[PDB]
Amino acid sequence: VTAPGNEPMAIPSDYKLVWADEFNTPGAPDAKKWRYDTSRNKEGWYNNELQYYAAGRPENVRVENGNLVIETRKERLTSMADYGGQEYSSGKLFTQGLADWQYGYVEVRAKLACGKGMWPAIWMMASDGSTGWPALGSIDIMEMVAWDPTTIHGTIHTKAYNHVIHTQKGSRTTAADPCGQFHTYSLDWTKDRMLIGVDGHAYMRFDNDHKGNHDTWPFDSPQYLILNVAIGGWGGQQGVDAAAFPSKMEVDYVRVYQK
C-alpha cells in the first residue's frame, strides 16, 4: 500500500451535483454523456489486454433497468471493420469530449464483472493529453481484477508515480460480493489531495506536495471519466475462464459534485 487512507468521505455540504448519468433512459448510452473508445481495437489494447471494445453494440454496452451494462462475451466480432483478432468483446465508454471536471466529488454506484480474466475499471484521465500517459495524470477510482474479486484498488498515475516504473500511488480495501451487490466507488478531488473510497470510507489518500511539479501533481486540470471491463493483462493472472462469460458491470449512476 503506497498511498494509504483511513478517513470518511462524503459529498461535501457546499458541493452541487453538476453532472450525472442516472442511466434512466433504456437503450444506447446517452451520446451527450458518453463516447465509445475504438482507438486500439484493430491493434490490440494496452496491458496485453484481450478484449475488442464494441461501439454502439447493445450486447456489450446498454442502459437497462436503471443501469449502464458493460458486458464481456466470448465471441469473435469478425464482421467489424476494426476487429483486431480478439477472442472477447467488451465495452469502454468515456466522457472525453462531452464532460470533464477540475476537482470535485465523483460517486459511481456499481456492481462489478466477475470471472477469472475480468478487469472492470472506473477511472479518469486528463482532458489535456499533450504530456501523454502517464504524465497527463490518471485516477483509478475503482479497479478490480476478478481472480481477486473482493479486492478494490484505488490508484493515481503521474510521470513520477505510475505502474510502468512501479511507483504508482495506490491502496486497496475489500467489499462484500462486489459482483452481486452495489457499492459506491468514490473520489474526493481537491487542489490539496485525493481520497478514493468505497461506501463512504477512504482507503486511499494521495496529497498534493504543493511543489508545483506536474510530475507529482498533474491534478490542477480537468479530467474525464472512463468505464470499461478489460479482459486479460492484470485481470488474467489466474487465466481467463470461458465459463465466466458473459460477465457484466452494472453502473446505477455516475454523479459529479463541485463547489
Ligand X SMILES: OC[C@H]1O[C@@H](O[C@H]2[C@H](O)[C@@H](O)[C@H](O[C@@H]3[C@@H](O)[C@@H](O)O[C@H](CO)[C@H]3O)O[C@@H]2CO)[C@H](O)[C@@H](O)[C@@H]1O
**Which residues contact ligand X (rule: CB under 6 A)?**
46-47, 121, 123, 132-133, 138, 140, 143, 157, 163, 230
Q: Does 189 bind Ca ion (CB under 5 A)?
A: no
Q: Which does 163 bind (CB under 5 to 8 A by kind): ligand X, Ca ion, none?
A: ligand X
- Is 252 annotated in a binding site? The answer is yes
Compute the 3-state secondary structure of the chain and give helix, strand, coil in percent, each to the nearest 5: 5, 45, 50
Q: Does 182 bind Ca ion (CB under 5 A)?
A: no
Residue 180 Cα to chain centre, angstroms: 18
Q: Does 84 bind Ca ion (CB under 5 A)?
A: no
The region that residue 23 occupies, defined by phi over 0 for left and psi between -120 and 50 for alpha, beta otherwise, is: left
- Is 66 annotated in a binding site? The answer is yes
* Phi, psi for 244 (deg, rounded to 5): -75, -10
**x/- letters, 20..39, toward Ca ion (CB under 5 A):** --xx----------------
| Distance of closest approach, residue 57 Cβ to ligand X, in angstroms | 20
Q: Which does 123 bind (CB under 5 to 8 A by kind): Ca ion, ligand X, none?
A: ligand X
Q: Which of residues 58, 66, 222, 246 is near Ca ion by CB under 5 A? A: 66
